[PDB]
Symmetry: C2
Subunit: 304 residues, 2 copies
């Protein structure tokens, strides 16, 4: 009963979070095995951020300039390396809390859990979707950089994102754990274009399905629509075009509810064209696209 | 930058979660020190639930009938006791992960983090507010009973709630850790009245403040209102009456934004009377009352 945005437990990732201080900059780092991963802008000052020649800036820096701290214990840095926009600091100690883990570059529309931290200490945890434009809508203050997004699959933690930059929209941009930014963004204090953010249609249709499963079916219509015809309305409202694969994924849901995907699409088409007339689906007066079909299934199944 | 509903890290509570099985019922239990806390309806069958004489039902049950399991290890139950609607099972082993903790009965309007579990295993984590009518809007399936709500204060975990019952609204009801239900609810499968749910006004005014802090100020009006006059409009729209203490709490916020509390109340009064005209505050097309003024401050401060 009830459907809520739900983050994965943070316990395993909690133990992998360390304070990284370079000069006057302090942020968060991820300690797995002998390596601590941090955004490379820890080396940069305010002035450095505007035009950073990170290669040149790193040459000045040396292992002893990096202050890695777990709790109240410091780690011996015995090597620095810069992979893309992330710096990997080799340390003497393996993290004994290092869990089964993978590093995955996530596809747009996918979702993950952010463990937001400050000075190596976990503050809180919330769900995020990788927006199609490769931004995210998080909560990130100064020193939250290095905070990571993850999914869990039983024992394994698939790390997918590391917070690096805030955009003037208010939204956020970051890398995969190999240091490649999601999107056309860079670690520089320059004007940055957060392009047209489109709605993850498949994810809204899953939420609609989730609503039906929880007994909200006011939106339901008496008719259907075609892929082509639906997408003709999707485009107008800046929705991602729906694909046959999207349909296939929304199948178990379609099945479980005894409702066809295109009939659901027709209900969305009315909801877009006509609005919601002051009503709410699942306690929300607008359409939610940060719910993957797996996410809806996982709550409905009750997977742990 | 950005404001998101945010749960407390779940790591410490994760280690305090155990599977409790009585006969054919399995649910979640909280292992702190030598005691495991669980909803007493674990003893009850389906038929037992309709008219349970828990005193009589417990006399039949004996320690060996209680299957407490952590991971893949079982605990020796050496005593059972029923405090109100919670059963405390003494076990041989102390939880070595038992953290600094308190048991607090929470006031309505207060918020907490739910660590939703199944069979003793944490599934996910989300924020909840204790609705004025003493229900909550969670996500709880069969076997999520025993899942607990908590707040953290640095080292200490203040446990405040334990999930016990689902109401036909879809919403949820549970106890404090001493086993007293929040509200006029009971552990019985009977029709239960989830009375008029009023809006936590102070919490909406904090969210409005949080929006201002994040740069959303379209709602802002050019005028003010009085306590009496505002509450005259609050009542109509099923809002909690605003108190001088509510004002005092919303002070640091009022201060930080350079906006007076009653001017904010006037903006709310328009928002209530007139709606939102298709616009959104903080990515939401309706007013949010699950944000305590402390909650808004904690994100804005960045407390860890």
């Amino acid at each position: 009963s009830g459907f809520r945005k739900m983050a994965f437990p943070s316990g395993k990732v909690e133990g992998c979070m360390v304070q990284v201080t370079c000069g006057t900059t302090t942020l968060n780092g991820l300690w797995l095995d002998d390596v601590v991963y941090c955004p490379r802008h820890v080396i940069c000052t305010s002035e450095d951020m505007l035009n950073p020649n990170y290669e040149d800036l790193l040459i000045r820096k040396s292992n002893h300039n990096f202050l890695v701290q777990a709790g109240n214990v410091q780690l011996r840095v015995i090597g620095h390396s810069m992979q893309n926009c992330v710096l990997k600091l080799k340390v003497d100690t393996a993290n004994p809390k290092t869990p089964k883990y993978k590093f995955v570059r996530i596809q747009p529309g996918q979702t993950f859990s952010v463990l937001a931290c400050y000075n190596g200490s976990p503050s809180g945890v919330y769900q995020c979707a990788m927006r199609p434009n490769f931004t995210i809508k998080g909560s990130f203050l100064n020193g939250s950089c290095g905070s990571v997004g993850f999914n869990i699959d039983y024992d394994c933690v698939s790390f997918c994102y590391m917070h690096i930059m805030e955009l003037p929209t208010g939204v956020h941009a970051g890398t995969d754990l190999e240091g490649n930014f999601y999107g056309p963004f860079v670690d520089r204090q320059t004007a940055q274009a957060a392009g047209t953010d489109t709605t993850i249609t498949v994810n809204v249709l899953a939420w609609l399905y989730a609503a039906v499963i929880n007994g909200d079916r006011w939106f339901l219509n008496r008719f259907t629509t075609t892929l082509n015809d639906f997408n003709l309305v999707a485009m107008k409202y800046n929705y991602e075009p729906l694909t046959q694969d999207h349909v296939d994924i929304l199948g178990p849901l379609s099945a479980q509810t005894g409702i066809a995907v295109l009939d659901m699409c027709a209900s969305l088409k009315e909801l877009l064209q006509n609005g919601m007339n002051g009503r709410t689906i699942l306690g929300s007066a607008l359409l939610e696209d940060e719910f993957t079909p797996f996410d809806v299934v996982r709550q409905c199944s009750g997977v742990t």
